[PDB]
Structure 1
Amino acid sequence: ELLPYPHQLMKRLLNRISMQSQLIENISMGFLDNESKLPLLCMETELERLKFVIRSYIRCR
């Protein structure tokens, strides 16, 4: 079956991807001026892992 769409869940996640992707860019402006880079690497690879689940979800439906 085509299951019913998670309306409020999807609006929430598409906010957090927009806010988090702005945050990763803002933190990359501090690096122009400790200064350890693992949390930047994790915040970026988490958005790739999350954007994949939503793309794979929408492409499926």
Structure 2
Amino acid sequence: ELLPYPHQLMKRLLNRISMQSQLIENISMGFNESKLPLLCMETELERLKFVIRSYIRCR
């Protein structure tokens, strides 16, 4: 069965991924060189995008 949509959860997740997108772009404008937090941001963003993409593709 097609499950009910969690509207508030996905709206909060898109708002959070948008704030993280502007955060990582602002830190990229801000670019000692400790690039491992930026790498954590980067794989953070693409793994969250994969989860959202797979959930929406399945439904």
On whether the aligned pair clears a TM of 0.5, the verdict is yes
Structure 2: gaps spanning 5 or more residues: none
Tell me by how many angstroms 1:30 deviates: 1.2
Tell me by how many angstroms 1:45 deviates: 0.4
The list of structure 1 runs, each at least 4 consecutive aligned residues, that deviate by more than 4 angstroms after superposition, is none
Tell me by how many angstroms 1:52 deviates: 0.4
TM-score, length-normalised on structure 1? 0.92
Cα distance in 2 for partners of 1:22, 1:28 equals 10
Instruction: Determine the structure 2 residue equivalent to 1:25.
Output: 25
Structure 1: gaps spanning 5 or more residues: none
Identical pairs, percent: 100
TM-score, length-normalised on structure 2? 0.95
Describe the superposition over 1:9-61 as per-residue Cα deviations: whole angstroms up to 9, x where unpaired: 00000001111011001001111xx3310000010100100010000000000
Number of positions where the alignment pairs a residue of Structure 1 with one of Structure 2? 59
